[PDB]
Design a protein around this ligand. Structure first.
Ligand SMILES: [Fe+3]
Length: 51
């Protein structure tokens, strides 16, 4: 699944993860650490919406 940051338009793609920020590919959005934030704009997880 892909989730969009409602603040800046960054798409968290679970297939891609966010390796530069310690998230390996295939990591589900719900599995992201609670302290994970949008790597672009810094938005907390609350600000993402599943597509
Ligand atoms: Fe963002």
């Amino acid at each position: 699944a892909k989730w969009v940051c409602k603040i800046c338009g960054y798409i968290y793609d679970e297939d891609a993860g966010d390796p530069d920020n310690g998230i390996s590919p295939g990591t589900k959005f719900e599995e992201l650490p609670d302290d994970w934030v949008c790597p672009i704009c810094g938005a907390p997880k609350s600000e993402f919406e599943k597509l």
